[PDB]
Amino acid sequence: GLSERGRALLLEGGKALGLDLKPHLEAFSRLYALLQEASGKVNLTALRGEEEVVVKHFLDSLTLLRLPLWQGPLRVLDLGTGAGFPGLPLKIVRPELELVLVDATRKKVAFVERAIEVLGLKGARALWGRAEVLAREAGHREAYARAVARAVAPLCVLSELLLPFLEVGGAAVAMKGPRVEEELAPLPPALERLGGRLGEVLALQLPLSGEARHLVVLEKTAPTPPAYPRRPGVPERHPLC
Numbered sequence: 001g002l003s004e005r006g007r008a009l010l011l012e013g014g015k016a017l018g019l020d021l022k023p024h025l026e027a028f029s030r031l032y033a034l035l036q037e038a039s040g041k042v043n044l045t046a047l048r049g050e051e052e053v054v055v056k057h058f059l060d061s062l063t064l065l066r067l068p069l070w071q072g073p074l075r076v077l078d079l080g081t082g083a084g085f086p087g088l089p090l091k092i093v094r095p096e097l098e099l100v101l102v103d104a105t106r107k108k109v110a111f112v113e114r115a116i117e118v119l120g121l122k123g124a125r126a127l128w129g130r131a132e133v134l135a136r137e138a139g140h141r142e143a144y145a146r147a148v149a150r151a152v153a154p155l156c157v158l159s160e161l162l163l164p165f166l167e168v169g170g171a172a173v174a175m176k177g178p179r180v181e182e183e184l185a186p187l188p189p190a191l192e193r194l195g196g197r198l199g200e201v202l203a204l205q206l207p208l209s210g211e212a213r214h215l216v217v218l219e220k221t222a223p224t225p226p227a228y229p230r231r232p233g234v235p236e237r238h239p240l241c
Ligand SMILES: C[S@@+](CC[C@H](N)C(=O)[O-])C[C@H]1O[C@@H](n2cnc3c(N)ncnc32)[C@H](O)[C@@H]1O
Pocket: 079, 080, 081, 082, 083, 084, 085, 086, 102, 103, 104, 105, 108, 129, 130, 131, 132, 149, 150, 151, 152, 161
């Protein structure tokens, strides 16, 4: 679990994000333990340091909350969640959200489900599948108020993966690093074809790290055309921009 120092870092970082993480210290400590346990099994690799996990993953995920987009029982998709980021931190601090965490890798879906159970989270589930396939399902196509994604794909690709999941009026957040100018430059025309438009591009400093970040908001302004998203692998191989 999180050390006293680890808790203090999380707490301080949360404040800089405008959050009171005091009621959530235990949950994050429990999640960190889960990550430790899982990582321990693998012999070639190890979990990154406590401080790096708290700052570059717990707090990084929580930067989503700098955007005023998470009030009420919103239906949210975490696309390509991996080990549950940024989805799990988001769900912990915003319990009202109806969260579906998707990943094409079954073993990661299994971990997230385990974390949900262990943390005793309600209104959150992991789902095994490809974004391109799920976005063709009556259960999921344009059925989300929100979608988020970190470290999945360049904006041109990611926009095709995310936008089809959103109901009109909804919004997705593409979490990005220090530089986005190049990825953004050719984006607008592609967004429009997808029925989206660029919302806020919130530049901020990741607290306690010295590193810049960008939260790229993709608003759903109109229905996505039947063409999108294209079959699995196609957005990646033939990006819209
Ligand atoms: C680099 S990991 C990032 C994990 C997590 N989002 C994070 O930031 O820590 C990218 C994850 O997205 C998943 N992924 C990539 N493309 C996907 C797709 N088209 N549909 C579902 N999952 C996808 C991969 O399986 C992988 O686990």
